[PDB]
C-alpha cells in the first residue's frame, strides 16, 4: 500500500506457500524423475 508503510513483522507471505510452489514445479518442465 502506502510507500512508507513498511511493517517489520507480519503473518505468512503469499510467496511462502510451498504447497503451491511444489505443485507448479510438477506442472512445469523439470529434469528426469524416478520411474
Amino acid at each position: 500500500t502506502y510507500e512508507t508503510f513498511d511493517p517489520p513483522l507480519h503473518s505468512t507471505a503469499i510467496y511462502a506457500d510451498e504447497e503451491e510452489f511444489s505443485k507448479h514445479c510438477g506442472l512445469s518442465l523439470s529434469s528426469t524423475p524416478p520411474g
Binding site: 502506502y2 511493517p7 507480519h10 503473518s11 507471505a13 503469499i14 504447497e19
Partner: protein, 225 residues
C-alpha cells in the same frame, strides 16, 4: 475473564490425562466437524512499533488494535465500521459518512488492509466456518502478544488462537464449544472435542501444542491483574 477460566480448566483436564501416553491413541475418534469455529485470524501485521497490530478475519473483515487501546473494524462490505473505545464502548458508523475524528484511523486501517491483501496468505482459506453473518456477531482482537515460538491472539468471543512461526501450525481454541481446531504443516484442518481427546488420546505434536496453549492461557490470565 470467565471464558479464559473455562479454557484453562478444559486444557488442564486434557493435559493432566497425558493424552499422548496411551497404549493406543485414537485421535480420529475425537473429531467433530460440527464444532468448526465461525471466526479465526487469517492474516495479521505487527506494526506495534508505530501504529499497532492489524489483522484480517476469515470473513475478510479487517481490524486494527491501535497503540492507544482503541480498535477499528471494517466489515467485509468495505464501508461499515465498528469503533471500540478504550473502556470497551462500541459505536457503529461508515467510511462514507466521513467522521472527521476517525479519518486518520480509517486511513491507517486501509493501509493494513491493502498490505494484507497484497502480500499475505489467507490462513484457513480451504475451509468453511460454521454459520453465516446473521448468526455471527463480529468479534474483535482483545489482546495479543508474541513469544519465541508463536503469536497469541485473544478474540472478544473467548476464542484463543496460536500461530507457531517454526512450522506454520496453528491452534484455534473455543471455550464455548470446549473444542480445539488444529492446522498442521500441510494446512489440513481438524476440530476436536477436548473431552474426547482426553478419552481417546492424541498424537505428541498436538499434545505438546496443547501444553503450550495452557501455558499461554495462564499468561493471559496473569496479565489480567
Amino acid at each position: 475473564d470467565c471464558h479464559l477460566s473455562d479454557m484453562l480448566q478444559q486444557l488442564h483436564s486434557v493435559n493432566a490425562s497425558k493424552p499422548s501416553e496411551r497404549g493406543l491413541v485414537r485421535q480420529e475418534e475425537a473429531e467433530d466437524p460440527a464444532c468448526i469455529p465461525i471466526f479465526w485470524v487469517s492474516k495479521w501485521v505487527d506494526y506495534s512499533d508505530k501504529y499497532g497490530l492489524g489483522y484480517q478475519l476469515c470473513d475478510n473483515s479487517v481490524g486494527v488494535l491501535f497503540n492507544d487501546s482503541t480498535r477499528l473494524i471494517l466489515y467485509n462490505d468495505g464501508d461499515s465500521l465498528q469503533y471500540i473505545e478504550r473502556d470497551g464502548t462500541e459505536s457503529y458508523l461508515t467510511v462514507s459518512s466521513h467522521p472527521n475524528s476517525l479519518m486518520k484511523k480509517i486511513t491507517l486501517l486501509k493501509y493494513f488492509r491493502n498490505y494484507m491483501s497484497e502480500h499475505l496468505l489467507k490462513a484457513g482459506a480451504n475451509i468453511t466456518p460454521r454459520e453465516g453473518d446473521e448468526l455471527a456477531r463480529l468479534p474483535y482482537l482483545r489482546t495479543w502478544f508474541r513469544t519465541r515460538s508463536a503469536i497469541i491472539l485473544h478474540l472478544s468471543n473467548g476464542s484463543v488462537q496460536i500461530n507457531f512461526f517454526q512450522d506454520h501450525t496453528k491452534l484455534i481454541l473455543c471455550p464455548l464449544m470446549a473444542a480445539v481446531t488444529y492446522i498442521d504443516e500441510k494446512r489440513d484442518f481438524r476440530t476436536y472435542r477436548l473431552s474426547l481427546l482426553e478419552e481417546y488420546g492424541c498424537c505428541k505434536e498436538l499434545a505438546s501444542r496443547l501444553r503450550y496453549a495452557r501455558t499461554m492461557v495462564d499468561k493471559l490470565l496473569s496479565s489480567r491483574s
